[PDB]
Amino acid sequence: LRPREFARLSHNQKKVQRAYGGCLSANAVKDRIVRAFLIEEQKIVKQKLKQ
Amino acid sequence: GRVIRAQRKSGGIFQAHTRLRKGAAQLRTLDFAERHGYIRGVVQKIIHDPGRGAPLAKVAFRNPYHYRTDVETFVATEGMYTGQFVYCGKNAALTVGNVLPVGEMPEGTIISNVEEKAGDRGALGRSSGNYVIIVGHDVDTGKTRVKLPSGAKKVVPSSARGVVGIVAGGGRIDKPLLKAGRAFHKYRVKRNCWPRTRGVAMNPVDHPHGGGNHQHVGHSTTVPRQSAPGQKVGLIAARRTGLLRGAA
Amino acid sequence: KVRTSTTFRRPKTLQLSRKPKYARKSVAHAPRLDEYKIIVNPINSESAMKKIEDDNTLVFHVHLKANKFTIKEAVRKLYSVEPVKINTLIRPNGTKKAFVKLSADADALDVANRIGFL
């Protein structure tokens, strides 16, 4: 649609029922979740091995 | 006579054509993080800049004092890629793309977009394929000696920052343009400086070289350094002329 | 005196409203363009007559500065009828003409006769 036509749709037509729905693709979100988890776990081990 | 072409290049139709340019290529304002530590940024885009040989890199940094992200426009060094992490500051590692004080890098390192004054955000070695070489440090009253692309040796303070690596965009000038039209397109996105009419092709009113019943200059084309505008044409303050056979 | 921003901004101060010692103008002006200025005259050309008897609409010469809001009120106050829509045009002689359509519960022909331009 043209940009202002989006102001007339209902909420769910402008998004997907998922995190970052309507802003990130499904595969991009999946990369973000896995990347966030693995990086956080690495921060945990680096903190554990620092002591 | 009339005002010669060189004297008319003071603005107006001779301004740079800058509509298609996305931003100046600058180092990043020298701040606390870079003075004392490092800060990490991620390469978001590597883009063509109309009128510039080298590509530019848009690099995203976190703002240390506010919840916001600051995008910087760097001259891309060869090897840089989107998604790469770059590190700027005193404690950044000596890796292609990182930004370090020249005093923190050993003699012989190859760098680009080097500051003349600490914090001027990049002056030296910026065009495609160019770089600056670290020659030596003088720790007492810290001054770093560098070699410039022209071959000149320069002394910058050992706090002026530099980017590790050579400016991307390679050996652009190795390719013959081959056609007037290709030169047309190269300068169309730069400024109104092409094509160029020769001075001797003109009339005396137009140029000191103009006139005569053959196309010739008349007097010497090596003119003094202190010539007035309108007579400062040809080979200005030339130390020598002619085809050099072995130089340094 | 803690400043958490590196930017000095002008502090907010009282800013009193005007309390004049004298009214600059002694007498307020009466309403300019009330209703006798807005409606100048009925228009009774042949085309206007057809508008009256076919589309239930009246044609008026009105003030150049009248709009569709004030023309509606003026017609209601002067002739006690309720326009449903008003269309406006500025004629090539520079004067403004209004097409005032009346509701289906009023007859434009009767209103025209009552005004007296028929």
Added chain:
Amino acid sequence: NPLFVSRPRSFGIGQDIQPKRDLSRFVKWPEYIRLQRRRKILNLRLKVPPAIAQFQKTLDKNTATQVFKLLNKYRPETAAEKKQRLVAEAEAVANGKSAQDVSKKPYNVKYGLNHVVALIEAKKAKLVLIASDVDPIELVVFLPALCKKMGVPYAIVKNKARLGTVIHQKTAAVLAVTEVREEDKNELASIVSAVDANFSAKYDESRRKWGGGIMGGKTQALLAKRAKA
């Protein structure tokens, strides 16, 4: 209770958004504030000629309180007090003698720069109090030399504004005591002796010493570091 867990923030370089600290030192101030601050600095550098440097040497707190205690006793009459005196003179000027018969000689501090200068030149000032912050300083820069020449005790005291309060004005460049009631003669003499030991006795040697000339801040610490090594 178990849900209340500490969540520390590091605040090192590149870790957490810095907390809201005091940035007053690095604020870009409006021009008038900048001017009045760098003006105080420039007066600290820029070695000060002795006739200007003798100011900024003011009376101590204790002597200043005694002086103002005496001055506050001899305040000039206010407009209300003056109006009351005039109605008394008017009532007594109808059936009795002149206004002298019903009003007494006034005892009050003298003020007004031209008036006080004349009193000093005529040797009628017993004590002269010179404000310390007269902004065009030339108005009073000669007063210590004039007082010393005429042998009248003088003190440089803080706040032209404090002097002005005594005489019911916003500010006063200088005040003079000409006469004091008998009950205050000993206090004036003690103040005069205290003032003289600090100022009149100083004047001979104060004419040579220069003010300012001091750098401070970072440059002095560098000198201190230079000395320590």
Added chain:
RNA sequence: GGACAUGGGUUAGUCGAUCCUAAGAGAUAGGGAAGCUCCGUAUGAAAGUUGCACGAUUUUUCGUGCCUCCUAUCGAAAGGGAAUCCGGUUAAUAUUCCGGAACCAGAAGGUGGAAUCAACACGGCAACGUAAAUGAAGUUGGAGACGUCGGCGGGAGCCCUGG
């Protein structure tokens, strides 16, 4: 007769302008200049419209508050851009009038429905789906938003063809 004379004639929320910014123009700060004026456009300026309810009965936008990188305006009837179609009608207007059938934007909240018994719905492995499916500040992302040539595939109107 486009001449001459007398009259008549141009109807809009949806078409333009109006709004936006472009090259550019240009007040202001400030500095030049005898001056007409010249330079300058967050510029060396105390350049604040916006974000919070602490008072406030009581069911709500007026007082201080502590706040934060905001900003003049002009500049496109071919750039960007909310929304209208058919049939009819006049001597002469029509996406503007008439008949019929729509659409957009804003305001208030007029009904109905939905979720919530403690909290803001379910389905699908998933891509994702639905009549609705609470979301302040702040931030980030997207659309607006973009060259040119070449052939290939579809659609619409036109063209051609059989009754």
Added chain:
RNA sequence: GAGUUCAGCGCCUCAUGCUGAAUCCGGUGCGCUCUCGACGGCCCUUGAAAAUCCAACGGAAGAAUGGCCUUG
């Protein structure tokens, strides 16, 4: 029910009214004009901006309760 085509009736006719039929079924493309879709080539040329609209991350704030007639 509009539009089009055709055939009749009143016949000074008037508001120019009234009454009948048809407007159906097939095919075609290196065609034309526009357009969309997926692509390919080219550049030391890589081909506006802003208004405006939308989405997300975030979690501010809310007050229904007497197993039900009761609010946001």
Added chain:
RNA sequence: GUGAAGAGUUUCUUUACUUAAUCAAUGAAGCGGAAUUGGGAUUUAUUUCCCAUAUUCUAGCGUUAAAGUUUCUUCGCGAACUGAUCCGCGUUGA
């Protein structure tokens, strides 16, 4: 303007300062100095001769404070300290 050496009652060269003046940056965003700190040489040791940092990860996220004692009296996203050491004659650099 302010200070230091040198030259046969004086002003000439260089070798120092910054507050005048000039340049550049920025949202004038962390400058300078102390105190705690741990290797250190002094050394039957005393920070006395020495300055020590927190983010390298892979295209994530990072804001509107948690915790900590503890004061109203502990009805409260309630007030303060703190978390975020102290101090200042300089926004920073040349």
